[PDB]
Amino acid sequence: GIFPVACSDGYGGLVTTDPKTADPVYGKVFNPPRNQLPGRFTNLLDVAEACPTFLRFEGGVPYVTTKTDSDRVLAQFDMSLAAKHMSNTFLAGLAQYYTQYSGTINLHFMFTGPTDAKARYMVAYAPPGMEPPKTPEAAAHCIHAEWDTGLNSKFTFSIPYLSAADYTYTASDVAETTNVQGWVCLFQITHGKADGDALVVLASAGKDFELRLPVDARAE
Amino acid sequence: GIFPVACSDGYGGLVTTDPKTADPVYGKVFNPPRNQLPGRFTNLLDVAEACPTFLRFEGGVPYVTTKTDSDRVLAQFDMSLAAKHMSNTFLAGLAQYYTQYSGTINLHFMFTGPTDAKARYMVAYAPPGMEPPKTPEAAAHCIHAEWDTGLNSKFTFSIPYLSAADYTYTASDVAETTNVQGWVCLFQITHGKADGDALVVLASAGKDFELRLPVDARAE
Amino acid sequence: FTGPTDAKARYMVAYAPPGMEPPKTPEAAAHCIHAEWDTGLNSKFTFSIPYLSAA
Amino acid sequence: SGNTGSIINNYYMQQYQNSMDTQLGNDWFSKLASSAFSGLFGALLA
Amino acid sequence: SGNTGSIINNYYMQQYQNSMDTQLGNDWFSKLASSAFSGLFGALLA
Amino acid sequence: LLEDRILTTRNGHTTSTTQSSVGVTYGYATAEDFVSGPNTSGLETRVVQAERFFKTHLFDWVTSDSFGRCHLLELPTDHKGVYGSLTDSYAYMRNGWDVEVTAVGNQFNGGCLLVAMVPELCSIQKRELYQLTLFPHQFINPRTNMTAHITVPFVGVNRYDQYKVHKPWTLVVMVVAPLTVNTEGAPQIKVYANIAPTNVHVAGEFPSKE
Amino acid sequence: TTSAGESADPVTTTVENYGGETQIQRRQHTDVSFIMDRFVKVTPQNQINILDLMQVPSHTLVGGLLRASTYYFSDLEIAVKHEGDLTWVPNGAPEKALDNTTNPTAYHKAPLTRLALPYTAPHRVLATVYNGECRTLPTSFNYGAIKATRVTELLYRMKRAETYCPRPLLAIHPTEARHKQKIVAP
Amino acid sequence: TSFNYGAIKATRVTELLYRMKRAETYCPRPLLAIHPTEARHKQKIVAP
Amino acid sequence: TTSAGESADPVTTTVENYGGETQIQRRQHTDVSFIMDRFVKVTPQNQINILDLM
């Protein structure tokens, strides 16, 4: 007799994602050696942490310039990986292929003015549920950091993950009129003769930033 | 050569209940942590024992009120999980999804009259085969318990499983004119000034109550 | 409490510190240091008014 | 553990067949039902 | 090691299923990301 | 004639004492689950000053109310004290509830109330009231007692909540047997709640309106 | 036994109170895992179906019993009859993703496709009832979505199910003294 | 022209899908998202 | 932290700078092997197709 088997309905169709491999047809091929090639990367988030890329501000420029007028808001935008301000960063290019994330996103600010231009800046995270602050003073009640220019040109700040659920969506639903994850608010406290100087800003993934649930959604 | 196999007729179709699992297609997903959430339950009969729910008496009320007239029957109904009197209890809501049961069902009686209202009550189980008793005196020959009011407002009684077969049906067949499992008979022996006071009654599963043979039958 | 055995009540005592007008309702007064009690076998309830002052 | 009854081991890893649970840091109704009072409360006679 | 999840061993030899690698003689971005400075740089107060 | 079932609950600098106690029902758990998870990134804090009793009238139990008459109170409710201000200063919060409901008439009244703490109570149907005892509960029955006490932890699909859009718990009081007054009963019973937030944790500080 | 009925501590008396004997019970058919773990039919939309367990009718065994809990967790299996190929996309995907075949797409193989899917929501558990608007349930409460040229049958089966906080389970309300039915008989 | 994995031929080929096995990548290069026209790129996300 | 921004050495601050706590991350979905390993449709030529991933 031979071994009896039930060919089961509902199993066996090709799935574009399945965990199994095809049968081989052309054996024994040995490759050219490639051990030690420079520049390998294993995890897309190692490069998202190690390489910050630029934010995009009105005008299509990666910087904000100091204003000399009573308005102290340098920039205010949705803490969303689908924000226009984030749309040219590598982090946003990565995030479109996943549906959820959590963890820290770091912002970097670099002053580009001459040695006799000085300024003091403030970055605040405003959580959802109230309108974002319009002044340094209302914003002082948020988690925030303030710094000034000097020998070191750069300052880096971690935007905290704060949410009711443990993960958030990387895309923004057309129903969601208010940004679901809050705002980041960049202010100028004052400057001494920094008129017209640019503060350039970049973003990178923090230590516990995480993307999960791969998705392909047209997009490029 | 390769391994020969007999693809067997009569095996392999999808069964809505089968003991096997589908092939996976989207690996590696780690969930949000949920260890220690309050309120878990593992077995529907743990909640059927720990949470008694109310019986339904004529008028759509969960109680019976003391009568002041020569009729001492407070309530008499079929010991059936399909009885109208049981139809709003959780035990009956559970029992409709199984075809057989056995074991104890507990009835709880709670007096709600004021401190100067007193009464004495009797509950009896009348087994099938004779008409249910109409008086406390005829009913004294049944398994029965009698109690009165006082500092403790509640009394609980186990209806015994007694049957020729080891399991009974939770549904009632349209052919069965007399209830197959007997009656429970609640009587008022007397009262002192308890006119109009309500005795509320609940039911819960006993220690050895058991439901077996899951069935889905439209019903809600 | 001095009422008969079939009279029942529940009471609240609150200490309202200076600096705001004293509360006029149990609900506004719930935010103060306060205690609430009811009648029963023991007829008496005792409460300590706290000393609270700048000096 | 639900309604499953194969004696041999799954062909796929557990990490593909199910989501994996993580920890931070019949539980309640079982404890509740076990704690039920099953005594008497009077003095019993006979 | 990518997206593969069978517990049992392949029916075909490795030499047929894949090309074989040879040697002569997350590597860089992992080392790079691990070396990131995560400190402070001032004197901290409170 | 009267009773020694005597309890004092203290929550912060507020205490409440009854002499007709019956005990407290703990719902679903005896302690809160983890208050610190990944969704607040270690930025959450406890604010002990909000853990104290506040008070609200619920309804007046009168002889014309019959079986099924309900009063619901979604929690959190308006609070004009420090818990209430917490909800305008932080985007995320979690707390449990320590709940005391009082219905005082006297022992010559009859009838019965069921008080229950129900989660996610998007309203109830009539037949479901026969199974309200599935929720953490206690009865108030005038020949025995005047106070119901239930303690419940935070629950929800999320470890921290946004109370401005979601209410996890509803206190419900239901008449299970109608009030009787007879010749010595009180003529009606006003039902009041004395409630304390427990374990309150907040995260995500808001700007001011300045 | 008498007891204080106001209290809510469970009281379970036994037949031993009057001389009987409590028997042994075997309760594996009311185990939550076991009983939720079987397929149930839902009526499908023609093409896009979002996988939402609240679609199973409330009178069915699985719908009756899922609604008897307020929070739940499970993984999922689906069996689908469809024309064309079937694509599934996880929770949070843009609806347009349902047209890209690198998302898990199962090529048609008669007579139906049976798939094992993970829990994918961003929440630690989901709920059958949510008191935000008071009917509607947050849009993140789902297991993703599927699409094919036509889907004809869709069955859901809960795997590894957990339930928290029980809620009312109602039987038929009989009009007469007993709900009577024709029971299978020789 | 040497950058290829060979070639296939049949009387008609109707569908062709590729799947990379054991992939290694060296030297990262720009990965661009959609550029939104409004302040956020909004989409209809799968919802019950 | 401030640092010299001209340099290009990576700087990764954490929420600990203002009192938060960095959580654990599980990054298997951004592993290169894993993520490249799924089928993708190309539009074919009728007969000869050279296999070219571009």
The CA R_g of chain A, rounded to the nearest whole Å, is: 24
Assess I42–H contact: CB distance below 8 Å, yes or no: yes
- Spatial distance between the Cα atoms of E9 and D11, rounded to a whole number of angstroms: 10
Sequence ranges of the domains in chain B:
1-220
Element (H, E) at C38: strand C33-38
Question: How is residue H16 written in tokens?
Answer: 């062709």
- Experimental approach was X-ray
> Where are any strands of DSSP class E within chain A?
3-5, 40-41, 53-54, 63-65, 73-78, 98-102, 105-111, 118-126, 143-148, 154-159, 168-169, 172-173, 183-192, 198-205, 210-214
Q: Are G71 and G126 in contact (CB under 8 A)?
A: yes
Sort out which chain I residues have CB atoms less than 8 A from H25's CB and list them.
32
End-to-end CA distance of chain I: 42
- How far apart, in Å, are the Cα atoms of F128 and each of B126, F125, G68, G162, G172? 30, 5, 11, 23, 12
Assess B214–A contact: CB distance below 8 Å, yes or no: no
Structural domain span for residue E40: 1-46
Q: In a 3-state reduction of DSSP, which class is residue D11? A: coil
Buried b (16+ CB within 10 A) or exposed e, A13-46: bebbbbbebeeeeeeeeeeeeeeeeeebbbbbbb
Q: What is the per-residue DSSP string for B198-217?
A: EEEEEEEE-TT-EEEEE---
Tokens 């970055």 correspond to what residue? A123
Assess G21–D contact: CB distance below 8 Å, yes or no: no
Q: Are F49 and F174 in contact (CB under 8 A)?
A: no
Contact yes or no, G with C (3+ CB pairs under 8 Å): no
Question: How is residue B71 written in tokens?
Answer: 């009729």
Best G48, G54, G140 member to test H by mutation, with max H CBs in 10 Å, is G140
Contacts of B179 (CB under 8 A, 6+ apart): B78, B79, B80, B83, B128, B172, G178
Buried b (16+ CB within 10 A) or exposed e, A118-154: bbbbbbbbbbbbbebbbebebbbbbbbbebebeebbb
Tokens 């109208």 correspond to what residue? B84
Q: How close is the nearest chain B Cα to the Cα of E8, in Å?
A: 15
How many residue pairs bridge chain A and chain E with CB atoms within 8 Å of each other? Answer: 80
Cβ-nearest to A19 among B8, B22, B24: B24
Q: In a 3-state reduction of DSSP, which class is residue I32? A: helix
- Spatial distance between the Cα atoms of F205 and A143, rounded to a whole number of angstroms: 7
Contacts of D5 (CB under 8 A, 6+ apart): B19, B20
Contact yes or no, H with D (3+ CB pairs under 8 Å): no
CATH number of A1-220: 2.60.120.20
Q: Is I8 exposed, middle or buried (0-12, 13-18, 19+ CB in 10 A)?
A: exposed
Where chain A is broken, by preceding residue (C–N > 2.5 Å)?
A: none
Q: Do I32 and A44 touch (CB under 8 A)?
A: yes
Sort out which chain A residues have CB atoms less than 8 A from D16's CB and list them.
19
- Spatial distance between the Cα atoms of A189 and A182, rounded to a whole number of angstroms: 22
Best D13, D19, D20 member to test E by mutation, with max E CBs in 10 Å, is D13
Q: Under CATH, which architecture does the G1-186 domain have? A: Sandwich (2.60)
Sheet holding C33-38, edge to edge: C10-15, C33-38, F14-18, F7-11
Q: Do A17 and G105 touch (CB under 8 A)?
A: yes
- Spatial distance between the Cα atoms of F171 and F118, rounded to a whole number of angstroms: 6
Question: How is residue G43 written in tokens?
Answer: 């009526």
Q: Do A211 and I2 touch (CB under 8 A)?
A: no
Sort out which chain H residues have CB atoms less than 8 A from I50's CB and list them.
4, 6-7
Contact yes or no, C with E (3+ CB pairs under 8 Å): no
Contacts of G130 (CB under 8 A, 6+ apart): F120, F122, F157, F166, G137, G138, G141
Question: How is residue F126 written in tokens?
Answer: 């009539």
One-letter amino acid for residue B128 of the chain: P
Assess E38–I contact: CB distance below 8 Å, yes or no: yes
Please give the backbone phi and psi of residue D15, each rounded to the nearest 5 degrees, phi first: -70, -15
Contacts of F6 (CB under 8 A, 6+ apart): C40, C42, F17, F18, F19, F21
- Spatial distance between the Cα atoms of C51 and G137, rounded to a whole number of angstroms: 53
Q: Is G139 exposed, middle or buried (0-12, 13-18, 19+ CB in 10 A)?
A: middle
Q: Do A40 and H25 touch (CB under 8 A)?
A: yes
- Spatial distance between the Cα atoms of B65 and G137, rounded to a whole number of angstroms: 42
| Beta-carbon count within 10 A of A93 CB | 22
- Spatial distance between the Cα atoms of B194 and B66, rounded to a whole number of angstroms: 6
- Spatial distance between the Cα atoms of G122 and F159, rounded to a whole number of angstroms: 12
Sort out which chain D residues have CB atoms less than 8 A from G159's CB and list them.
2, 18
The CATH code of the domain that includes D41 is: 4.10.90.10
Q: How close is the nearest chain B Cα to the Cα of I26, in Å?
A: 8
- Spatial distance between the Cα atoms of A185 and A189, rounded to a whole number of angstroms: 12
How many residue pairs bridge chain G and chain I with CB atoms within 8 Å of each other? Answer: 7
What single-letter DSSP state applies at residue B193?
S
Beta-bridge partners for B76: B185
> Where are any strands of DSSP class E within G58-149?
69-83, 86-89, 105-106, 113-117, 126-127, 145-147
Q: Do A28 and E15 touch (CB under 8 A)?
A: yes
Q: How close is the nearest chain B Cα to the Cα of I14, in Å?
A: 22
| Beta-carbon count within 10 A of C29 CB | 18
- Spatial distance between the Cα atoms of I50 and B50, rounded to a whole number of angstroms: 70
| Beta-carbon count within 10 A of B130 CB | 10
How many structural domains is chain E composed of? Answer: 1
- Spatial distance between the Cα atoms of C26 and C34, rounded to a whole number of angstroms: 10
3-state secondary structure B136-183: HHHHCCCEEEEEECCCCCEEEEEECCCCCCCCEECCEECCCCCCCCCE
Sequence ranges of the domains in chain G:
1-186
The Cα diameter of chain H in Å comes to 50
Q: How close is the nearest chain D Cα to the Cα of E18, in Å?
A: 21
- How far apart, in Å, are the Cα atoms of B111 and each of A24, B39, B156, D42, F115? 80, 30, 12, 18, 17
State the chains in contact with B (3 or more Cβ–Cβ pairs under 8 Å).
A, D, E, F, G, I
Q: Are A97 and A48 in contact (CB under 8 A)?
A: no
Q: In a 3-state reduction of DSSP, which class is residue D15? A: helix
Q: How close is the nearest chain E Cα to the Cα of I41, in Å?
A: 18
What single-letter DSSP state applies at residue C21?
P
Please give the backbone phi and psi of residue H16, each rounded to the nearest 5 degrees, phi first: -135, 120
Report angle CA F28, F33, F37 to the nearest 5 degrees.
145
Residue F12, phi-psi category: left (phi > 0), alpha (psi -120 to 50), beta (remainder): left
Sort out which chain I residues have CB atoms less than 8 A from G101's CB and list them.
39-41
Resolution to 1 decimal place, in Å? 2.6
Q: What is the per-residue DSSP string for chain F?
A: ----B-EEEEETTEEEEESB----EEPS-SS---S--GGGTT--EE-GGG-S-EEEEEEEE-TT--TT-EEEEEES----SHHHHHHHHEEEEEEEEEEEEEE---TT-EEEEEEEEEES-S---TGGGGGGGGSSEEEE-TTT-SEEEEEE---SSSSSB-TTT---EEEEEEEEEEEE-TTTS-S-EEEEEEEEEEEEEEEEEPP---
Sort out which chain I residues have CB atoms less than 8 A from G102's CB and list them.
38-41
Sort out which chain H residues have CB atoms less than 8 A from I53's CB and list them.
5, 18, 20
Nearest CA in chain A to I6: A153
Assess D19–G contact: CB distance below 8 Å, yes or no: yes
- Spatial distance between the Cα atoms of B138 and B135, rounded to a whole number of angstroms: 5
Please give the backbone phi and psi of residue F71, each rounded to the nearest 5 degrees, phi first: -135, 125
Q: In a 3-state reduction of DSSP, which class is residue I17? A: helix
Sort out which chain F residues have CB atoms less than 8 A from D24's CB and list them.
34, 37
How many residue pairs bridge chain A and chain H with CB atoms within 8 Å of each other? Answer: 81
Sort out which chain H residues have CB atoms less than 8 A from I32's CB and list them.
23-25
From chain D, which residues contact A within 8 Å (Cβ)?
12-13, 16
Domains (range + CATH), chain F: 1-210 (2.60.120.20)
| Beta-carbon count within 10 A of F198 CB | 18
What single-letter DSSP state applies at residue G122?
S
What single-letter DSSP state applies at residue G132?
S
Q: Do D28 and F29 touch (CB under 8 A)?
A: yes
